[PDB]
């Protein structure tokens, strides 16, 4: 709706890609598409929505949240980008349900093409508020969502502890997560994981992660191939929600 | 005359820079100058923050185990070590938070553990790098306050570990260090039910921190953060608030 600025911040081998990926998207009558931001937090959603969008779109507050949501809309080459940032969904040790309510009946008529459930990198655990996320999502929206779902980890300029190679480290925390949330949602198929850093930089011209990988064309791309996959999209009905 | 004294202490000094050493040797003199012949530190926090991790740094020897993904040991760990007539006691525990709430199994045991020892410094851990405070944190405070009394936090020290950490969006580490520390200390105040101490320390545990030129692990604030802590430790064992009896009236 306002002009995604944003990508002219970009690399240009990220611009050229993003114009790329954006292009197979119409060339496939994929013109909108929304993407639901949902998590924990402080675990980088709204720095995540305005790492996509290339500007400072929603509000950080490195120390404490917050209840909005927003969606911001940015057109380009003739396709439009919806992003949904939206509170945190635990409060204590419970889901504040509130702030649930409020994510569902703001998406009331809104379709869910891609969720970015976002979480940390860096953390050394998951547990029974992983759990209750995971089964929030499922209760809200259905266990369909989950094969428009992709799972991304933030902080990922992360250097393991103990010499744990980035890689163990990394792949011992996705299954870790993985496992907790197939538990909460209740459930393969994908379900993809892919790396953030929002940091900002960063180490071509775009910013590349301590596995070799550019990560913005990673996730729009990602974002791509779950936007293609069928699946069929969400759309929020009222229905819905009293599930 | 002379005999064959059997002591138990402390390979693990040894194996810091020799600049950290010579402090560390000098707080122990403090200590005994003052006639205090042994510290017992009791170590308590949220789970995954750092607790095994630092003890294994202030011993300077692995005796108590790492957990970057898993728990695991549910039982406290004392380790004890001596040097020139001090013994150091410093009592390793479990995370009292799982999920959502406390574990009563962690704590119980931790209390149980403690009957007859004497606290004389608690050493409250968490993360630099944690960028929100709720009541968790706040239910951990008060269960530590339920369980010895107002007065342990008279030798509390609140420790913040990865130390190592440059802060987002260009906010100076001092600053950030201080709204960290405000946050928590808040929180703890009122999960407590306090209202100086409590001092705050910087950690940093990792093999691969930054060191000063007499090759001590330094924070990025320019400080040695061992003999710091080390030195923290021993004003406060020094303070003049009682050390806290751990009878079967405190832990009921
Ligand atoms: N190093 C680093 N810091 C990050 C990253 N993502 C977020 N942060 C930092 O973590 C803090 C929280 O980010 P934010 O986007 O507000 O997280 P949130 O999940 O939206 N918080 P809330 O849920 O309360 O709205 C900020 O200080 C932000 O800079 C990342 O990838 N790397
Ligand atoms: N970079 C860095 N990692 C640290 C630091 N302290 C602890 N860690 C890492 O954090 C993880 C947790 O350490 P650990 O000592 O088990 O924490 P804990 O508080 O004892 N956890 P638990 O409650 O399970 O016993 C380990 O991977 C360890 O390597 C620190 O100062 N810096
Ligand atoms: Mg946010
Ligand atoms: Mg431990």
């Excluded at 209840?67 to 919806?82: H, I, K």
Aim: hydrophobic share 40%; charged share 20%; net charge neutral.
């Amino acid at each position: 709706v306002r002009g995604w600025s944003g990508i002219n911040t970009f690399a240009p081998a990220t611009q050229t890609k993003l114009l790329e990926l954006l292009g197979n998207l119409k060339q496939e009558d994929v013109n909108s598409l929304t993407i639901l931001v949902m998590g924990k937090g402080g675990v980088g959603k709204s720095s995540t929505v305005n790492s996509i969008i290339g500007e400072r779109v929603v509000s950080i507050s490195p120390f404490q949240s917050g209840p909005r949501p927003v969606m911001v809309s940015r057109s380009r080459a003739g396709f439009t980008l919806n992003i949904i940032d939206t509170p945190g969904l635990i409060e204590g040790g419970y889901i504040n349900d509130m702030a649930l309510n409020i994510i569902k009946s703001f998406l009331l008529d809104k379709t869910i093409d891609v969720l970015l459930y976002v979480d940390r990198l860096d953390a050394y655990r998951v547990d029974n508020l992983d759990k209750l996320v995971a089964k929030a999502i499922t209760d809200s929206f259905g266990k369909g969502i989950w094969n428009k779902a992709i799972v991304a980890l933030t902080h990922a300029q992360f250097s393991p502890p103990d010499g744990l190679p980035y890689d163990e480290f990394f792949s011992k925390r996705s299954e870790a997560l993985l496992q907790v949330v197939r538990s909460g949602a209740s459930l393969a198929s994908d379900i993809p994981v892919v790396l953030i850093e929002n940091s900002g930089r960063c180490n071509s011209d775009e910013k590349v992660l301590p596995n070799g990988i550019a990560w913005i064309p990673h996730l729009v791309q990602t974002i791509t191939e779950v936007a293609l996959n069928k699946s069929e999209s969400i759309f929020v009905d009222k229905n819905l929600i009293d599930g």
